[PDB]
Design a protein around this ligand. Structure first.
Ligand SMILES: Cc1cn([C@H]2C[C@H](OP(=O)(O)O)[C@@H](COP(=O)(O)O)O2)c(=O)[nH]c1=O
Length: 149
């Protein structure tokens, strides 16, 4: 990138994944946490016994994912580069693929947290989420709050 055009794609080094949308990597050579943009996990606070539903599933999904990826990159949007929590906001790409899209592919993370101007990849994640709905991938299975304990 000799000049600036759209976003700023850069390299990254996986360090320790914690949740499905939370993975600490290495940026600029220093340790930092990154949060998938335009996406949100199905409540993965993992307090103790978990909800026994989508607890241990999304977090590991991205864990082994970037863990086996040959390379890890990030794409900061045109909006801010860090949130109020000091988290880095960008799109992680594993093997030249959009990891965020992989999650929506397995119906593990639904689109959420959309605030301009950080939403350039909101279109691709949009049509993708719709495909996950027709694919019924976990979260997109049942549809009601009754008889689930
Ligand atoms: C991802 C994202 C999060 N947020 C805020 C809303 C949420 O506030 P609260 O912390 O009060 O819930 C929090 C969610 O981030 P996470 O998706 O990392 O949990 O960050 C934005 O304002 N814009 C964004 O693009």
């Amino acid at each position: 990138a000799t000049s600036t055009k759209k976003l700023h794609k850069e390299p990254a080094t996986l360090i320790k994944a914690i949740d499905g949308d939370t993975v600490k990597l290495m940026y600029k050579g220093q340790p930092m946490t990154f949060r998938l943009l335009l996406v949100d996990t199905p409540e993965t606070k993992h307090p103790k016994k978990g909800v026994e539903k989508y607890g241990p599933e999304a977090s590991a999904f991205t864990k082994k994912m970037v863990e086996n990826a040959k390379k890890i990159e990030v794409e900061f949007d045109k909006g801010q580069r860090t949130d109020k929590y000091g988290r880095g906001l960008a799109y992680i790409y594993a093997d030249g693929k959009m990891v965020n899209e992989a999650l929506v592919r397995q119906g593990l993370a639904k689109v959420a947290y959309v605030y301009k101007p950080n939403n350039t990849h909101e279109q691709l994640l949009r049509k993708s989420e719709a495909q996950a709905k027709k694919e019924k991938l976990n979260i997109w299975s049942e549809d009601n709050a009754d008889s689930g304990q």
